[PDB]
mmCIF file of all heavy atoms in Angstrom:
data_model
loop_
_atom_site.group_PDB
_atom_site.id
_atom_site.type_symbol
_atom_site.label_atom_id
_atom_site.label_comp_id
_atom_site.label_asym_id
_atom_site.label_seq_id
_atom_site.Cartn_x
_atom_site.Cartn_y
_atom_site.Cartn_z
ATOM 1 N N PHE D 389 19.317 4.302 2.164
ATOM 2 C CA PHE D 389 19.464 3.477 0.921
ATOM 3 C C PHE D 389 19.428 4.321 -0.347
ATOM 4 O O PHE D 389 20.145 4.043 -1.340
ATOM 5 C CB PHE D 389 18.340 2.461 0.826
ATOM 6 C CG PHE D 389 18.358 1.399 1.883
ATOM 7 C CD1 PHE D 389 17.434 1.431 2.919
ATOM 8 C CD2 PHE D 389 19.262 0.337 1.801
ATOM 9 C CE1 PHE D 389 17.423 0.424 3.868
ATOM 10 C CE2 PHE D 389 19.263 -0.667 2.746
ATOM 11 C CZ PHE D 389 18.329 -0.629 3.780
ATOM 12 N N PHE D 390 18.628 5.375 -0.307
ATOM 13 C CA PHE D 390 18.371 6.215 -1.509
ATOM 14 C C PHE D 390 18.812 7.659 -1.355
ATOM 15 O O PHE D 390 18.512 8.500 -2.206
ATOM 16 C CB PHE D 390 16.854 6.119 -1.824
ATOM 17 C CG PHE D 390 16.352 4.714 -1.880
ATOM 18 C CD1 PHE D 390 15.167 4.346 -1.261
ATOM 19 C CD2 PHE D 390 17.085 3.709 -2.566
ATOM 20 C CE1 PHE D 390 14.669 3.020 -1.345
ATOM 21 C CE2 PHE D 390 16.618 2.418 -2.652
ATOM 22 C CZ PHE D 390 15.391 2.049 -2.051
ATOM 23 N N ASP D 391 19.597 7.938 -0.301
ATOM 24 C CA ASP D 391 20.011 9.291 0.100
ATOM 25 C C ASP D 391 21.514 9.459 -0.058
ATOM 26 O O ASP D 391 22.302 8.869 0.717
ATOM 27 C CB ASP D 391 19.623 9.548 1.572
ATOM 28 C CG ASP D 391 19.874 10.981 2.026
ATOM 29 O OD1 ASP D 391 20.629 11.767 1.375
ATOM 30 O OD2 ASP D 391 19.285 11.293 3.085
ATOM 31 N N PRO D 392 21.938 10.251 -1.067
ATOM 32 C CA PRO D 392 23.376 10.472 -1.261
ATOM 33 C C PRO D 392 24.160 10.871 0.026
ATOM 34 O O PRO D 392 25.326 10.572 0.161
ATOM 35 C CB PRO D 392 23.420 11.616 -2.287
ATOM 36 C CG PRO D 392 22.077 11.585 -2.974
ATOM 37 C CD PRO D 392 21.103 11.084 -1.974
ATOM 38 N N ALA D 393 23.521 11.621 0.895
ATOM 39 C CA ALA D 393 24.207 12.138 2.119
ATOM 40 C C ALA D 393 24.796 10.991 2.949
ATOM 41 O O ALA D 393 25.811 11.189 3.583
ATOM 42 C CB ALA D 393 23.255 12.960 2.969
ATOM 43 N N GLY D 394 24.126 9.820 2.910
ATOM 44 C CA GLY D 394 24.522 8.566 3.530
ATOM 45 C C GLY D 394 25.293 7.646 2.631
ATOM 46 O O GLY D 394 25.644 6.553 3.038
ATOM 47 N N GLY D 395 25.558 8.076 1.389
ATOM 48 C CA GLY D 395 26.162 7.188 0.398
ATOM 49 C C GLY D 395 25.145 6.325 -0.349
ATOM 50 O O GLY D 395 25.508 5.383 -1.068
ATOM 51 N N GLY D 396 23.870 6.623 -0.167
ATOM 52 C CA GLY D 396 22.822 5.926 -0.917
ATOM 53 C C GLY D 396 22.647 6.521 -2.325
ATOM 54 O O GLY D 396 23.387 7.424 -2.714
ATOM 55 N N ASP D 397 21.679 5.999 -3.072
ATOM 56 C CA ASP D 397 21.525 6.341 -4.522
ATOM 57 C C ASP D 397 20.021 6.221 -4.874
ATOM 58 O O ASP D 397 19.455 5.144 -4.807
ATOM 59 C CB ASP D 397 22.326 5.328 -5.331
ATOM 60 C CG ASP D 397 22.330 5.609 -6.803
ATOM 61 O OD1 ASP D 397 21.675 6.577 -7.193
ATOM 62 O OD2 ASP D 397 23.015 4.847 -7.540
ATOM 63 N N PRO D 398 19.372 7.338 -5.234
ATOM 64 C CA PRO D 398 17.964 7.287 -5.744
ATOM 65 C C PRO D 398 17.787 6.268 -6.864
ATOM 66 O O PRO D 398 16.744 5.580 -6.949
ATOM 67 C CB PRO D 398 17.743 8.715 -6.282
ATOM 68 C CG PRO D 398 18.700 9.546 -5.543
ATOM 69 C CD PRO D 398 19.928 8.691 -5.332
ATOM 70 N N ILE D 399 18.837 6.098 -7.665
ATOM 71 C CA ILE D 399 18.769 5.124 -8.803
ATOM 72 C C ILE D 399 18.624 3.667 -8.364
ATOM 73 O O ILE D 399 17.970 2.849 -9.017
ATOM 74 C CB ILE D 399 19.970 5.340 -9.744
ATOM 75 C CG1 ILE D 399 20.040 6.834 -10.216
ATOM 76 C CG2 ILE D 399 19.927 4.349 -10.900
ATOM 77 C CD1 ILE D 399 18.728 7.369 -10.762
ATOM 78 N N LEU D 400 19.127 3.319 -7.181
ATOM 79 C CA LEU D 400 18.864 2.006 -6.692
ATOM 80 C C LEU D 400 17.371 1.744 -6.573
ATOM 81 O O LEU D 400 16.914 0.621 -6.868
ATOM 82 C CB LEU D 400 19.575 1.787 -5.302
ATOM 83 C CG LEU D 400 19.153 0.526 -4.623
ATOM 84 C CD1 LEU D 400 19.561 -0.712 -5.385
ATOM 85 C CD2 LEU D 400 19.742 0.493 -3.197
#
Side-chain angles (χ1 to χ4, degrees):
Chain D
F389 294 106
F390 310 135
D391 186 343
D397 184 358
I399 305 310
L400 170 65

